[PDB]
Design a protein around this ligand. Structure first.
Ligand SMILES: Cc1nnc([C@@H]2O[C@H](CO)[C@H](O)[C@H](n3cc(-c4cc(F)c(Cl)c(F)c4)nn3)[C@H]2O)n1-c1cc(Cl)ccc1C(F)(F)F
Ligand SMILES: [Cl-]
Length: 138
């Protein structure tokens, strides 16, 4: 049981083969969740499940540079369920962030922010009970 919004420092930023694991439970009437990998004020990778966007569930991913959102990448495969425990794993690869939810591949997001060693914070927010947030090298 951790407080949301939650800040996970990523010391010296990220590097390929770094695996970030977030464990929590989706709240029973959830509307949205958001992971924000940040380079100072810029959002290198915003991962945002939306539970009711025009009565559809969709994963929206994007980057924010100089406070402007870029072109979104959308994924209709939606592995979250309100009220259930989840595990989100973000594997940093040389050209992409690879995301798997509950041990099933979900999507990949090409690096738009290229100074990986400056993406030094992961913000976790939205309609979840957060259990744990940590990282390791695979
Ligand atoms: C219109 C519209 N419809 N969605 C968005 C933005 O789309 C972005 C992806 O492109 C992010 O999801 C933004 N966002 C969502 C959240 C968040 C999520 C959570 F889950 C929580 Cl808990 C939380 F606190 C915060 N913070 N910023 C979201 O506001 N916009 C939007 C809104 C503005 Cl002010 C400016 C530009 C846009 C644009 F379309 F260009 F992207
Ligand atoms: Cl949103």
């Amino acid at each position: 049981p951790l407080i949301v919004p939650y800040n996970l420092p990523l010391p010296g930023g990220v590097v390929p083969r770094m695996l970030i694991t977030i464990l929590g439970t989706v709240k029973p009437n959830a509307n949205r969740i958001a992971l924000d990998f940040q380079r100072g004020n810029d959002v290198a990778f915003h991962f945002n499940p939306r539970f009711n966007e025009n009565n559809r569930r969709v994963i929206v991913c994007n980057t924010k540079l100089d406070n402007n959102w870029g072109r979104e990448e959308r994924q209709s495969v939606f592995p979250f369920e309100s009220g259930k425990p989840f595990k989100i794993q973000v594997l940093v690869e040389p050209d992409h962030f690879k995301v798997a939810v509950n041990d099933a591949h979900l999507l990949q997001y090409n690096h738009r922010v290229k100074k990986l060693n400056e993406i030094s914070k992961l913000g976790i927010s939205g309609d979840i009970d957060l259990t744990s947030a940590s990282y390791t090298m695979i």
